[PDB]
Every structure is written in structure tokens, then in C-alpha cells.
């Protein structure tokens, strides 16, 4: 059982896999190993978790700064916002699924 990371995340190499999607993040923190908060939503509306988030129980396994991470998620069709974090450093992007 781990605690969620309290630092800030980054959006590096932007991306599909004929259904699922992949995104790489960079954690600027030393509290590792913590749970990486990742989800999809429709934002400014109590970010209700939509989608599936395929990657199993993502955790920053090391206490070293600027670790890289591959995360694959199941975003819904249409426009969406891949949220990576929890708190005030929660980053958000935009997605569109094959319409």
C-alpha cells in the first residue's frame, strides 16, 4: 500500500494502439515510491473518472527525481482530458478518439 505522490508531473513525448492510448510523464519529486494518479475526465466538473486506465497500479518505484513512466489508458470516444496527478499540480491534455 503506497501514498499518492505530492509533487508535480510533466508531459514529455506526446503520442494510438487501435483503441488504447500511451503517454509518458516525468515526476519531479523525491517522495518515491508513491502512486501515480492518472485518469481521464471532462474537467472543471469534479473530474469524474471516465475511461479505463489500463496500466496496472502505476507506482514510481524509485525515490530519485525526474523518473520516466509509460502509461496506457482507455480514453472514451470524442474529446477528453487526460488528467495526470491529484491536487493543484494535476496536469490536463486533450484527446479525440477516431470519430
Amino acid at each position: 500500500s503506497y501514498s499518492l505522490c505530492t509533487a508535480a508531473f510533466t508531459f514529455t513525448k506526446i503520442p494510438t494502439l487501435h483503441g488504447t492510448v500511451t503517454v509518458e510523464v516525468q515526476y519531479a519529486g523525491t517522495d518515491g515510491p508513491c502512486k501515480v494518479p492518472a485518469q481521464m475526465a471532462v474537467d472543471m466538473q469534479t473530474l469524474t473518472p471516465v475511461g479505463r486506465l489500463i496500466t496496472a497500479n502505476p507506482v514510481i518505484t524509485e525515490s530519485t527525481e525526474n523518473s520516466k513512466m509509460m502509461l496506457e489508458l482507455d480514453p472514451p470516444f470524442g474529446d477528453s482530458y487526460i488528467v495526470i496527478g491529484v491536487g493543484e499540480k494535476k496536469i490536463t491534455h486533450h484527446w479525440h478518439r477516431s470519430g
Epitope: 500500500s1 503506497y2 501514498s3 499518492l4 505530492t6 509533487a7 508535480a8 519529486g29 523525491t30 517522495d31 502512486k35 469534479t46 473530474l47 491529484v86 491536487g87 493543484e88 499540480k89
Partner: antibody, heavy 122, light 108 residues
Framework: EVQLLESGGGLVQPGGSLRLSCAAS????????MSWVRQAPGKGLEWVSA????????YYADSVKGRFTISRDNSKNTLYLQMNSLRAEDTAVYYC???????????????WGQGTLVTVSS | DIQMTQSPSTLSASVGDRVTITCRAS??????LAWYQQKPGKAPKLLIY???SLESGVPSRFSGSGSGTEFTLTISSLQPDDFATYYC?????????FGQGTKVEIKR
């Protein structure tokens, strides 16, 4: 109407234990993260511990780690802080503050209670 | 532990004057920085988050600025109820550390 009310403090011998409570009332507790911040009399604010809205995540300060335990009872809208190995330097007014944003980690302390005093001495 | 140190430790000024408090970090924390006010015997109050964003209810004379390492809190025109001790806090990472404070006093 965010009202917070700390309870459960007072005088305890060094090495003893005491547990604080905090009855939150004016917001959806099952959605916001709460923290414990203390203030030694005559000094500044030191951060003690913070817990998540679900309780799955719980953070502590090094001077406190392995001796205190933060807990939550989302059914009764109260928040606790179990202090089991109190020393003299833990003498402070302990505050119960709530995250400025729901489903967070305790980055900011939006509302504060007035506190409860713990004096650890022989 | 990110070290917040404020400056100065004690301020004296008269009503109407502009006062500026300072807070330097041990490392770069972009804009993750709050400010609180504490009146003697009362609990602290959140005044400004993310460096320059005022919290609802805080007057317009309070303003915030700064990024990375050096942030300042400014009161455009000191008023008789603005005298308190002011703390600094970075929430860039855990454990959320504070500064030592800055006591604003009224000249007369």
C-alpha cells in the same frame, strides 16, 4: 459554514500518549483532504501530518513519523491524530485544517480551527 | 526539506504606507506558494495561493508575485486591521514547509 472544532488535548507526561479529534461540519468531508499543523508557543507553524479524502494515502513529518498516526472516519465527519510517544518538543497548539481543493493531498490549508493545546511535561 | 525564509523578521509602518514582505526558497518551486495571516490568539487565514491568486474575501490591497525562488507579498495601503504576523508556505512538495513569519506593526 465551514466550522472546525479540535478536541482532545491537554497535559501528558513525556513518553505517554494522547489522541486529538476534529469534528468537521460545513462541507462534504468524503471529498476533501485534512492535515494537522502545530505551533509551538512563541514560534511559527510546523506541519505535522496530512491524510487523503479516502484515507488511502497518509503523510507525516520526520520529527513525527513512526510515533503519530493520522486517521479518518468519513461516516462521522471527524478526523483524528493518534500521538503515542510524546516528548517535550511536541508541546504546541495543534490545528486541524482542510485542503483548499477537494480530492487533493493537503497542498494548501484553506480553513483552520482555533486549535487545542498539548503541553508535555513531568 | 524546502527551506522557506522570510524577510524581514519584523516590520514597522504607518497606515496608508505600502509594505512588501519577502520569501526566498531553498530550491525552485515555480508558483506553488501560499501566504497566511495570523492575528495574536487566532488561527491562520489563507490569503493568497499560487503566488498571486487572492482567496475570496481578501481585500484588493493584498497582491502576490514571484516565481521559482523569490516571492513577495504586497499591501498597497496599510490599514489598521492588517497588523498581524504573516507566514510563507511552499506546497511544491512534501513536507509542506513554512517560513518563520513576518510581524507587521503599526507606526504611531
Amino acid at each position: 459554514e465551514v466550522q472546525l472544532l479540535e478536541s482532545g488535548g491537554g497535559l501528558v507526561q513525556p513518553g505517554g500518549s494522547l489522541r486529538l479529534s476534529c469534528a468537521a461540519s460545513g462541507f462534504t468531508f468524503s471529498s476533501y483532504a485534512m492535515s494537522w499543523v502545530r505551533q509551538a508557543p512563541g514560534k511559527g507553524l510546523e506541519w505535522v501530518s496530512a491524510i487523503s479524502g479516502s484515507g488511502g494515502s497518509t503523510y507525516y513529518a520526520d520529527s513525527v513519523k513512526g510515533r503519530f498516526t493520522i486517521s479518518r472516519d468519513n461516516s462521522k465527519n471527524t478526523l483524528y491524530l493518534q500521538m503515542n510517544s510524546l516528548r517535550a518538543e511536541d508541546t504546541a497548539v495543534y490545528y486541524c485544517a482542510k485542503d483548499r481543493g477537494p480530492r487533493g493531498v493537503g497542498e494548501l490549508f484553506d480553513y483552520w480551527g482555533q486549535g487545542t493545546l498539548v503541553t508535555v511535561s513531568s | 526539506d524546502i527551506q522557506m525564509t522570510q524577510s524581514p523578521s519584523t516590520l514597522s509602518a504607518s497606515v496608508g504606507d505600502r509594505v512588501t514582505i519577502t520569501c526566498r526558497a531553498s530550491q525552485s518551486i515555480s508558483s506553488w506558494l501560499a501566504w497566511y495571516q495570523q492575528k495574536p490568539g487566532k488561527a491562520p487565514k489563507l490569503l493568497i495561493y499560487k503566488a498571486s491568486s487572492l482567496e475570496s474575501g481578501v481585500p484588493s490591497r493584498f497582491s502576490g508575485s514571484g516565481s521559482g525562488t523569490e516571492f513577495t507579498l504586497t499591501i498597497s495601503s496599510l490599514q489598521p486591521d492588517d497588523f498581524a504576523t504573516y507566514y510563507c508556505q511552499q506546497y511544491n512538495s512534501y513536507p509542506w514547509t513554512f517560513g518563520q513569519g513576518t510581524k507587521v506593526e503599526i507606526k504611531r
